[PDB]
Ligand binder design. Structure first.
Ligand SMILES: [Cl-]
Ligand SMILES: [Cl-]
Lengths: 423, 423
């Protein structure tokens, strides 16, 4: 039906504006947190206290909204869209949309280590469901198609990356008709154009162009892969385990949870001023890191800072994503390997192994190799590292297989589902 | 098995060198055809006669080798690799490899309107089969996996485009295990690196960087799509029909066929000197055309010249591809629409609609939309036209659906199969 191809356009266009706002939203909440500190930019004990509390409040707000009204708006929300496409999960958009948005401005705006793609995809998905209900389109086809174009449009707008969005939903989320593919395109065209209208000529990741990688250099990317390939499934266990560790801290009780959350949002809000490249989504430090401005000491610091703050903010059921984070760890560890590879040798530039590393964690952890490659392509515009990036991918994603890990988003879903049976 | 991931490396590396030679091969045969004319670069009637006969011979040679020894080495050879993956077609590499190669140097070297990707994929496929037999690996898994990495490696090396190769085989040839995907990667890494070792710092398509497309400009790409979207299935009928039209000219008889072929190879060899941008694979004129050096009159000439020479050389069962051709028609028609769109208006540059058009025919005719997009990306390195290109794709590939056409490569196979039942 022409119906869905039309519907898909409108879902794209809503998901576009939806995400643009969630941006201008987070954007604006951080401007405030500047003024909160520029008022108190003398009294140093106070400076640190507002920094904390401002953030600690906003997390709690968001944390509350999830645990009050929309439980399944904790975490990424992508395992929920996975589950929905599997007809294993409801899409309660009437609850989820307003929660995941004001929830997300909570924790992202307080500067916790979460990405927008968490929100934008679950939202974008819920929005696809919302229009399906409104026009009361009947069938599995239309239920799934709008669900998916919503996700695709969400992800596209998170990273200004239409090709990424299409690839990830249509191809790297398990085994789509002829038309539902085009719906997803139409969904992702509109979504992008919206973002592009309200954002054009301001990128998320500047790195200009780095050099090629010499053919003699390539074998190194494969090793970087192999490392990410064992690290990915370890870090998965950590995020899966840490969900439990922080659950023995509050047993389910909402007041305990919203206290924990604002501690964890405050901590992060604090690190906002003191140690900036340990907070945020990653997108500030990625280019600073890729330009090579970080003393390998600082690298291993930021790496461990962020691998802890990431697990802390994400595994603690906050509304937010672990996708932008896994780009920033990708870059920071890529850079390190990079410097170590330059010292150890060839015509290398640690720069190029950041780019390569950036997508490597998506390959290793969530097991979307092509999405990762095409994403860093679209974000950095470094055409010239595609073969390294394919090589890093293979390595990352072969080891992650043999080291026995599973796709993070599925393992999350398959818990959520085993829980909604043994209860 | 580690066995196939190893095997896949060796298939990649053979398919790499295989294709590199088929290049240096065609490369070298055309150097000769220069000297044949630079000898006779006064006597103008003679100049034209060697030009013809040189080419007319080489076609016949190749045409002979197909019709003598390896029938299923006529045409693209990709419908055969399709059919093989479906277990519907044998892969007689012992016959096909030496035919498709020396066959292909025949017709490509004589400057007929065929692409290398025809050869390189069927060859690359056959090479995957060849190593499967040599190590006598048992199973469907390994039969299919090496077959596919061979195809993927072939296509990658045809266009120096690893991401294209992976995408097309793994995703845009119908509904692959976990490991057979990685085999295909490993296959395509090696294949590329080989090509890259023997070719680096000399591209197939220079166009530098053109400008963006303004959001106000986008709707135009969709119309260009819509046009390609009706043209694709028409041009399919033509190539399918023309196979028959040229078959009522020789009823099957080899001597008739090899005469027809050398006429058609001679014709093309002639147009080599007289009207160059009507002969070859396209890759010379694509950039000349995209730079905008062609008077819209000349465009519509070259368009009709090539749509006839293409159908003539391809539908006449020559060893060669209709993929590079469909890039050159993509570009020439994109450019035209381009000029007409500039005249009619906005901040346009016909340049950008060439790029867009280039992949549009792959989308419309063979129905590999993403492969087409990612290919022109990898070949031109114009990052900045991805959203136009997605838009052109949708348009191209929606209409091609509703206008009722099928994927060219499948329709070819499904004939070949209906023939091998009603006989
Ligand atoms: Cl996420
Ligand atoms: Cl072809």
């Amino acid at each position: 039906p022409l119906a869905i191809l039309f519907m898909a356009a409108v879902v794209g266009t809503l998901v576009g504006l939806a995400a643009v706002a969630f941006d201008k939203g987070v954007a604006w909440l951080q401007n405030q947190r500047m003024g909160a500190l520029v008022h108190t930019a003398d009294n140093y004990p106070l400076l640190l206290t507002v920094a904390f509390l401002c953030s600690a409040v906003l997390a709690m707000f968001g944390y509350f909204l999830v645990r009050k009204y929309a439980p399944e708006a904790g975490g990424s929300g992508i395992p929920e869209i996975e589950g929905a496409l599997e007809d294993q999960r409801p899409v309660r958009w009437w609850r989820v949309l307003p929660v995941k948005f004001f929830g997300g401005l909570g924790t992202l705006g307080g500067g916790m280590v979460l990405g927008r793609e968490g929100p934008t995809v679950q939202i974008g998905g819920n929005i696809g469901r919302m229009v399906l209900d409104i026009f009361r389109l009947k069938g599995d086809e239309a239920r799934h198609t709008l669900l998916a174009t919503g996700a695709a449009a969400g992800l596209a707008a998170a990273f200004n990356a239409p090709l990424a969005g299409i690839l990830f939903i249509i191809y790297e989320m398990r085994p789509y008709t002829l038309i539902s593919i085009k719906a997803v395109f139409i969904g992702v065209i509109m979504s992008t154009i919206m973002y592009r209208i309200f954002n054009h000529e301001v990128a998320l990741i500047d790195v200009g162009k780095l050099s090629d990688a010499p053919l003699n250099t390539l074998w190194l990317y494969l090793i970087l892969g192999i490392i990410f390939g064992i690290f990915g499934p370890i870090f998965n266990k950590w995020v899966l385990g840490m969900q439990d560790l922080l659950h023995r801290v509050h047993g389910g009780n909402i007041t305990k949870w919203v206290l924990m959350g604002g501690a964890i949002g405050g901590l992060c809000g604090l690190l906002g001023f003191v140690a900036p490249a340990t907070s945020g989504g990653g997108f500030n430090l990625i280019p600073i890191a890729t330009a090579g401005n970080f003393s390998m000491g600082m690298l291993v610091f930021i790496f461990v800072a962020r691998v802890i703050t990431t697990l802390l903010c994400f595994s603690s059921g906050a509304p937010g994503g672990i996708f932008a984070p896994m780009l920033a760890l990708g870059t920071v560890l890529g850079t390190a390997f990079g410097m170590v590879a330059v010292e150890l040798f060839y015509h290398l530039e640690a720069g190029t192994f950041a780019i390569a590393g950036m997508g490597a964690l998506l390959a290793a952890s969530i097991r979307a190799p092509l999405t990762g490659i095409i994403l860093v392509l679209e974000m950095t515009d470094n055409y010239q590292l595609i073969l390294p990036m394919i090589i890093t991918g293979l390595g990352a994603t072969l080891l992650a297989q043999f080291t026995g890990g599973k796709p993070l988003y599925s393992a999350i879903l398959a818990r959520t589902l085993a829980k909604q049976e043994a209860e």
